[PDB]
Symmetry: D3
Subunit: 120 residues, 6 copies
């Protein structure tokens, strides 16, 4: 297992999150949390035809259409830590009103706000 890789990536971009993710790694599926590391960030993110800042944004776009609040929220921090400004994080959620529709955009934005706001 070269699962050590996906980890080398998580601990420097979204460590607090995956750490909390394992707070599911216990009476349920720790195998799931496992997979979200050797295949998610260690087999897809590992490669690189696209910067890390970009990939985190593309994820935002996907999570906005799906309306996946919690997962989306988690990825906003990921993007910030990665090197994205709040300006970018929102310009993509606005572009989403065009393809996913307005409610989808409205929701994703309200969501990234929370993440933004709780630094105090």
């Amino acid at each position: 297992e070269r699962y050590r890789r996906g980890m080398e990536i998580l601990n420097r971009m979204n460590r607090k999150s995956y750490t909390a993710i394992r707070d599911e790694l216990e009476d349920v599926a720790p195998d799931l949390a496992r997979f979200v590391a050797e295949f998610a960030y260690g087999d897809v993110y590992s490669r690189g035809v696209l910067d890390l800042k970009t990939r985190e944004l593309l994820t935002l776009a996907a999570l906005t259409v799906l309306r996946a609040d919690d997962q989306l929220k988690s990825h906003v921090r990921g993007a910030l830590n990665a090197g994205c400004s709040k300006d970018e994080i929102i310009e993509v959620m606005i572009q989403m009103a065009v393809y996913a529709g307005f409610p989808a955009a409205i929701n994703a934005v309200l969501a990234a706000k929370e993440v933004f706001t709780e630094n105090d």
Copy 2:
């Protein structure tokens, strides 16, 4: 009013062939729809400035993968290739979409890409 153009020099630049293709619903119903495209989509959203055009045609593809919108997919694949995006890139966002939107979605879109990636090869 007229800003239509503010978003058209864009359209007529990247995916002209496309806007044209849709002006062909100019009858079956409201040109009014093709109007709102250039006039709102490209009029006020794409024109904005914080993300490069290349970066936007790449962010449009992702969403369209999840929605499985086949037609609109092939379209922006041209539009993306046009702004400078390479194969390796278009196909990278799709592969990445298997993780978030499911394998059936990343596969369905790649195939639609493989098609567009064929103009005058034969």
Copy 3:
């Protein structure tokens, strides 16, 4: 039982967007074919709180988001026969670009086009 209370409704609005779907279907799996007759038109449509011409529009709305192409066409012919103007039909597909995105509406109108032009 009152299977007719259903079929004695579907035989009006959409006589082939049914006759047919009781064939490329009820040739191998007829639990579904009855249910649609019995439950949808039998128990649900037969309700009367909203105009017939309204119920057809709301369905056209529903299928737009879902990208239900085939069932959409079938429900366009039915909106027409119910007495809806092409104008009205096209309207709902426009209002859908807002709450469900542009690709949804662009894809739905293209489908209404076909049905609109079925005979040369």
Copy 4:
């Protein structure tokens, strides 16, 4: 700009409450996402008059049910009401959605509407 007022005309009479809550996001995201609704949504789409505003309200409802959006559906049930739509009519569109969108969707929309209905 009779393309802001225009939509805003519709807005500050029908959906008086949650629009105001567009200032409730006026800080994070440019007033743009809150502007586009007024501008585009209600000034370029709802402004058209081939469909009664009432008919237009039940429509957004149909779509928002399928999308499982809860916030937007909640605030549009407030509008639906204000534009004249009776409770019985609202609920009706969602009973209709169980057939096209499925029971989980329909049940989910009616519970959220109950909130707007239970004393707001």
Copy 5:
């Protein structure tokens, strides 16, 4: 009136918590919709037996995980355990949904399952 009682019978017998819930939303509205769930959903389509009882319960959980219906998902898990579905089984189907619907759908569902496994 016929199938209505059949539907309610089943609901009561194996998901009493969801039974009562139907009584607490039958009021706002639908005796008509709460009717249809009792009448059509359970005593008309669920009571069909071409598929093992267990199987007919995992499918419901597969479907709900993809639609992200966190509400209906906790309720059906309850009725899944009631049908003899082991906790191992419930989690397995959700882990599999990660492949056909995406990681966010599974993670979301599993976490939902977690709340239920903690009476």
Copy 6:
């Protein structure tokens, strides 16, 4: 490796379909058909607490809501190849009328009739 497992199931249950690898080959997305064999099959379908016939049957349910036609078809084969009867396969789609609506069920049955008619 692992992928040796994935295939152990693929070339068994649904080989005729999985050989769509041929289609990703032209460097479009080959790397993709690999993840399918070594993750979808090598890491998930392999850890079988659930019977295969039930796993495939579940994929059918999932692909029915998603309205994934070109995919539903491939798994109906994969399902029949595991012993699933036709009447059984149409069953999961009938139930889906309740959870995903009549339009999704009808769209899955027709797709299935196609593969039942090869």
